[PDB]
Amino acid sequence: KVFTMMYDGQDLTDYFLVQEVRGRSVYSIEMGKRTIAGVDGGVITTESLPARELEVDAIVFGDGTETDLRRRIEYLNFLLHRDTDVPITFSDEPSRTYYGRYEFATEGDGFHKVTLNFYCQDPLKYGPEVTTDVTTASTPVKNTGLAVTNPTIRCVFSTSATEYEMQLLDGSTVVKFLKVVYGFNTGDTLVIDCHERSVTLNGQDIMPALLIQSDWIQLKPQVNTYLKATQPSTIVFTEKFL
Amino acid sequence: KVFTMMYDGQDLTDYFLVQEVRGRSVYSIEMGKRTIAGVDGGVITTESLPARELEVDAIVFGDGTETDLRRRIEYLNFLLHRDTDVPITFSDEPSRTYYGRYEFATEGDGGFHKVTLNFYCQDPLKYGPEVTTDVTTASTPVKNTGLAVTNPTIRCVFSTSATEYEMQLLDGSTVVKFLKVVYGFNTGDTLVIDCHERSVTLNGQDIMPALLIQSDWIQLKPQVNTYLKATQPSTIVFTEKFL
Amino acid sequence: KVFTMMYDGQDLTDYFLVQEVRGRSVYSIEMGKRTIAGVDGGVITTESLPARELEVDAIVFGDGTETDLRRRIEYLNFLLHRDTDVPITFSDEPSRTYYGRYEFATEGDGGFHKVTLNFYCQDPLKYGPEVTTDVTTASTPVKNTGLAVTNPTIRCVFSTSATEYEMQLLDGSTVVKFLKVVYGFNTGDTLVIDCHERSVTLNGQDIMPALLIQSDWIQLKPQVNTYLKATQPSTIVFTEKFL
Amino acid sequence: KVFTMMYDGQDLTDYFLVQEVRGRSVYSIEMGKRTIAGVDGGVITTESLPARELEVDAIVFGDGTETDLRRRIEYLNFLLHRDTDVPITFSDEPSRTYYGRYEFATEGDGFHKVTLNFYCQDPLKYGPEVTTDVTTASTPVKNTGLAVTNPTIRCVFSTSATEYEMQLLDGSTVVKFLKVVYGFNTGDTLVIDCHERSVTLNGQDIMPALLIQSDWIQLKPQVNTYLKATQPSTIVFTEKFL
């Protein structure tokens, strides 16, 4: 049972042997610094997380023959070239998914050492998704991840509806909220924040219902978020890490 | 039986001995990244395959004499300098052709002279064996056996009279793309090349107006079936391609 | 289908990954040189083949865990430590067996552990396929298809009665060497092994006194015919050998 | 037409490519030095030519396959292992033969570099053989080689014989000589000095004929040697070089 790397659901480690994986240690920060002549110090103007570069140091294991090796590489190119971000996973870190695509290779020097470089537009790893029940009272919802997350609201109606609201609060003060005036019974409303949609009874997008520009929610990490809904709801967020 | 390298049908390895050939490993991708200050992450804006540089590390085997060596190199220059892309092949990889031309040499150090020859390929892809498949008047699966996207060639030699010739690329029963032509006749051969973007008759006469409406050229994706249906029993010929 | 290394019938490459195998290139020779002061040149006094050291450069592939790695190495030690020479084979060289035993390891440097394993071979020669040739009651050419001198094995299953069994190595019509035996009978099999230096009957009973007078064991020189003639239709079995 | 190396009449360069051949430049000398404490300088006690080591730096050209390479090396070992000194020649130096045998290899680091080391008991190269006629008068015979040589005396009788003599001289003084009391007509006597034999009419070794311990001859280089025979003879020497 060796170290496995999965790229778009393909086990790449069936084609090569992984020496080391750089790109997942202490993350760095892009800072905009501005300095003025004669004035001591500097000033941080901007701060952002750079995109992630995963660098896999591999050994392409040869099939004895030379033509067999040439053909393995051709196939490896087939598996790697992607025009869309893709789920990347490592066996040493379960419950974690990276989303990026292969970018470039740097060939090193008995056999074939290669550094495969993968680019991730979204610098964050995505972990297990957590489902919490939200009652008609102030409910604490703790974001177990280490980064701020956007949650999916889910309410499968028990009684008739007129106006559905998922209010966020600070003790007893409504900070942000989500409102929908379309009412019915027995079906599932689905307010996702990562993709920003509004599904119904059996999956139809009811976008006109979001009346006022009701603020998109976020769950801060290692801290409770107090939520109160009109009807017994469900909050699903996905744990995220840098 | 040594390692042979062919350049424009000339056996270059009759002039030098090949140590190693770099340029044919895991291909890299040119990506246009755009970043905004204060905004986390980046955005891929463009993605393209760079041109290929083949690097042959050779030993020019001397003919004993010094003048003989000078003259071999002169001849080697004659064989290498090309003003047009050319078929390049290596014995370790049969059924594969590269198309490029020699660009530059970088020299090195007793009784033999080490050289790296650098070959530039405008078209980064290797071309393999060509495959011919029959396309019927019904949805026909055509599998691209190569590892890269290919631009095929449609060949149809008429049995009955024609009014309009159509080649439709479908998704089950939905026409995604198609290729029609208003010119009709019997007993002769028609050819649509998605690579060269050409219209051909018996003696290969241009039917430029044939692609009437944006009746698009399509392509064959790799390791996957492409479902095609023709008006008259046709033949599709594609060439397997690899990166 | 990776490169496999077999040691005593155990696939060692199930425990490590082979970078390279040194010890099987142009073999060297131990030469005893003697020189005299004031006298030009030197004199070769002795010449012998040194014992063989096979050097396998491997990567011990880890099982993720640290304890799992410690236990793999413990097991690897179990498979390697031998108090008797053993058959060693490499997938890149089929029809070849080395006979030796593991001697010592020399360690090296991230998420994988580089090691050179050193194997010692008392018998410097590789053993190949064994060949069986029929030897008639007339001068028979027997060609040693190996690349080194071999010590054959003579097998004769009697058809008629015997008084004395003889195997003569000749030069045209001149007996250079020969192998006789005074023990006679019918219907059973006799075996003379020039390697092991053994005398054998039906159930393999020692006929030690058979080699009576200095009736010498002989050898088969490589890429060359050896002319043998027997008293009763015999069979010679030799094993091809290489340096 | 590449650089060829011939070992025992086998073209070794059909199996490998020669980078360089060391061992045939300015020859070194073994000197016995003796020094005494308190006494200035040293004293050369002995002087001898060491045996020669030819070191061929080669590239074993691979046959594409791995097994093909293993088998080529096996064959190369077959061609090289010798229990007897053998004629060694290089295309860059025609009219020159070395006599030695392969000893050991030192394997170096895209392909297979090897140093093959050949040992020569006799440090000298052997060149073209020269045949000069020696008359019944003082004849100058010039040794065209660069080292001292031992010549083969050859006399094919025209008239009857009683005593054959090949006298070496210094002006008019017999320095060394060769005498044979066996006489006849029409046949060839053959006095070789390198192998020290005495052939007859059609090759029979007449060793008892060399009566007194008649001194074995030597031809000094780039200098005339004055020889006088009983019957018109022939002197054959072989040019030698360090």
From Swiss-Prot, chains B, C:
Its main location: virion. Keywords: Viral genome ejection through host cell envelope, Viral long flexible tail ejection system, Viral penetration into host cytoplasm, Viral tail protein, Virion, Virus entry into host cell. Pfam families: Sipho_tail, SPP1_Dit. InterPro entries: Dit_BPSPP_N, Siphovirus-type_tail_C, Siphovirus-type_tail_N. It is found in: Virion. GO terms for biological process: symbiont genome ejection through host cell envelope, long flexible tail mechanism. GO terms for cellular component: virus tail. The keyword Hydrolase does not apply. Homohexamer. Forms a 40 Angstroms wide channel at the distal tip of the tail. Remains associated to the tail after DNA ejection. This is Distal tail protein. It comes from Bacillus phage SPP1 (Bacteriophage SPP1).
